[PDB]
Design a protein around this ligand. Sequence first.
Ligand SMILES: Cc1ncc(C[n+]2csc(CCOP(=O)(O)OP(=O)(O)O)c2C)c(N)n1
Ligand SMILES: [Mg+2]
Ligand SMILES: [Mg+2]
Ligand SMILES: [Mg+2]
Ligand SMILES: [Mg+2]
Ligand SMILES: [Mg+2]
Ligand SMILES: [Mg+2]
Lengths: 92, 86
Amino acid sequence: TRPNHTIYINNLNEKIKKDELKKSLHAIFSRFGQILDILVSRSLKMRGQAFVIFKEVSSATNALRSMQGFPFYDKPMRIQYAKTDSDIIAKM
Amino acid sequence: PETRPNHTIYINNLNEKIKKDELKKSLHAIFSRFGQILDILVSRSLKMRGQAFVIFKEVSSATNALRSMQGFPFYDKPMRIQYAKT
RNA sequence: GCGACUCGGGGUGCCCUCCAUUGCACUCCGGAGGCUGAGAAAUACCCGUAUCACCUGAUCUGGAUAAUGCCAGCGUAGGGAAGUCGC
Ligand SMILES: Cc1ncc(C[n+]2csc(CCOP(=O)(O)OP(=O)(O)O)c2C)c(N)n1
Ligand SMILES: [Mg+2]
Ligand SMILES: [Mg+2]
Ligand SMILES: [Mg+2]
Ligand SMILES: [Mg+2]
Ligand SMILES: [Mg+2]
Ligand SMILES: [Mg+2]
């Protein structure tokens, strides 16, 4: 896949609240770069997943490569580059 | 706000199920790497459950502490650390 | 001041217990049962100049709860959709 400012994370523990996820996710991923936002959805379709939007793309690679498979609340987490830019990015 | 940087750190999202006594010990170890520790305050109120303070002798210490352990797994729950107010 | 009509604005969460789901979103709602609410999915409810819906602050603060804007604060904050008819 092509690099993107946004990394796609899944296999997340589904019982974690949107806000703890956001908060906790900012914890794991700050290191790599300035984050613009973390988008969580618990809707059947999008539960257990999340999108982390990075100001820099070097940052996302820097994150995905490093945090790949790393533990998160009792279970690993998968990371890939998002398939397409996020709105907040697109318009730039 | 502004996260104003000082020598004490405030961790939260800590595992509520763990004995506060053991928790303090596990907190001393894990953090005694970032320098001198003047004291660790683990919370005891059914409202402050899951949080604690780590008072470092030096401020720089607290800074590396935060950074490094930020989001670090601890009893199946990523730590979250910031500076304590004032 | 209530109230109609017309058109428009808006939110849809939490899990002490179960089942289903590994899902590429910004077109913002799975099933049972439980909680709050007017409303947590229906063109249902609510609202249209507003200290009288809702948003942004807020990944905010304080308290409670199984848990959640559940209750406070912030909040005379910054935004936010009007004409017509009738007593
Ligand atoms: C489907 C659904 N939509 C909306 C609500 C209502 N709702 C969700 S958040 C909120 C009010 C929050 O007010 P708040 O922001 O806490 O006032 P503040 O503390 O900012 O002063 C309401 C009424 C509901 N109970 N169910
Ligand atoms: Mg139900
Ligand atoms: Mg508010
Ligand atoms: Mg609160
Ligand atoms: Mg309120
Ligand atoms: Mg109350
Ligand atoms: Mg207001």
